[PDB]
Design a protein around this ligand. Structure first.
Ligand SMILES: COc1ccc(C(=O)NCCN)c2cc(C(=N)N)sc12
Ligand SMILES: COc1ccc(C(=O)NCCN)c2cc(C(=N)N)sc12
Ligand SMILES: [Cl-]
Ligand SMILES: [Cl-]
Ligand SMILES: [Mg+2]
Ligand SMILES: [Mg+2]
Lengths: 12, 229, 229, 12
């Protein structure tokens, strides 16, 4: 899936 | 489980676990620190958030891999069973975080920087629950995420400048909630644009270091707007 | 723990866990498959090895971070305590793998490709134990690693061509054992060089695909020799 | 620590 930017660690 | 370790030792070990990239340990240490019952400092809140974001992030990524395999298979029971296993563990982590926020981090948080932080977290972990939910359950979970984000937004607009990184990160995440959870892409775009523009106009007030902190998150809003328009 | 799941379902879920980068799950599924009591196929042996290599690799990396912080601190008790915690969990994983090899993978392995594979694994997990051991305990652990690697080497030289990837990976790991566990850098260099040269001369027998498999591991021998000379 | 090349996943 295209994941959009959210706050904090890009851990997924 | 951490009832026998000193609060300060739990925080110290959370920082060590972070350095060692042992995020399940880090989250357990910070859960123990929360359960001591004292409020958390700014650094401690961020340790709590970083720990659980890393744990739930791995679970979300795994769930998406398995869900994709499952959907293709539906174009034995093992794929569904294992997706369900990961899903249940993910829901358990979200429930644990929400439990800490409800018992009793939010109710003791009076300053805007703590209260907005925790209400944003509440929106985030309901959002992660929403990503794997279906049906009526999903609608109520989505409403819970929206309600937490909205209370956080209301406080942040009254009590924080538009460049405040907590306020910016809240707006970022609430805009993603709108785009792909609430199926409100126009609301997502409007929120990201307005947030970005109001922060731009307040950058003149910032030091060099604060400018870097705020513009970093502003770039994430821009990244999303570029994908969305 | 996996006694109620079908062997074939455990293998299927190990492959899914691999795709999802859930290596603790993958290792538990493969432990369950081993404990069904049947021998493992070539693919299944590699799933077992990949799973536990990933689990123990994270633990080794964390242990090294914590050990480094601890040594600097010794130039409160929390760093030592947490290093000990990770160390004990690492030793537990190694003991689990060694337990599977002893009960009863090695004794039922008669073909060179299975027996060498398992004896190499036995050397590897004693080597990981040796990395965190001290004193007399360390000497006996080192001897156990050496003995397993040596039996594997003897079989591999009698029963496998010099380009066989299992034989090559065994020689690679035994050479690293010599270099940094046994404090025998000259033995390490000699073994890596001889292994590389004898494989070179046997490449002419290989298909395009096998050539790629063998030269990949040969490059790892070269990488080490470049660092060592 | 400088880790030398060993077989299989470079997981550490
Ligand atoms: C913006 O969030 C943070 C603010 C402050 C700190 C901090 O260390 N000290 C300042 C005391 N107020 C921190 C440490 C994090 C970490 N270990 N990932 S995040 C994070
Ligand atoms: C060299 O090692 C392997 C050999 C074979 C396979 C395999 O799939 N099928 C062939 C049946 N003999 C395999 C799959 C791995 C994995 N899932 N990481 S390793 C690995
Ligand atoms: Cl399962
Ligand atoms: Cl500990
Ligand atoms: Mg429009
Ligand atoms: Mg010499």
């Amino acid at each position: 899936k295209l994941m959009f930017k959210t706050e904090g660690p890009d851990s997924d | 489980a951490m009832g026998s370790m000193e609060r300060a030792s739990l925080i110290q070990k959370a920082k060590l676990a972070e350095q060692a990239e042992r995020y399940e340990d880090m989250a357990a240490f910070m859960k123990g620190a929360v359960e001591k019952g004292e409020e958390l400092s700014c650094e401690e809140r961020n340790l709590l958030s970083v720990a659980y974001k890393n744990v739930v992030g791995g679970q979300r990524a795994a769930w998406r891999v398995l869900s994709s395999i499952e959907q293709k298979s539906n174009e034995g029971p093992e794929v569904r069973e294992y997706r369900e296993k990961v899903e249940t563990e993910l829901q358990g982590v979200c429930d644990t975080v929400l439990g800490l926020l409800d018992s009793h981090l939010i109710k003791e948080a009076g300053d805007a920087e703590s209260r907005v932080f925790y209400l944003k977290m509440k929106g985030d972990y309901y959002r992660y629950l929403a990503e794997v939910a279906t049906g009526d359950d999903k609608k109520r979970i989505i409403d819970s995420a929206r309600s937490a984000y909205q209370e956080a937004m209301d406080i942040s607009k009254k009590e924080m400048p538009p460049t405040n990184p907590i306020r910016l990160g809240l707006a970022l995440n609430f805009s993603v909630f709108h785009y792909e959870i609430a199926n409100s892409p126009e609301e997502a775009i409007s929120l990201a644009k307005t947030t970005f523009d109001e922060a731009m106009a307040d950058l003149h007030t910032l030091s060099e270091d604060s400018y870097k902190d705020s513009t970093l998150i502003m770039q994430l809003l821009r990244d999303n707007l570029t994908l969305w328009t």
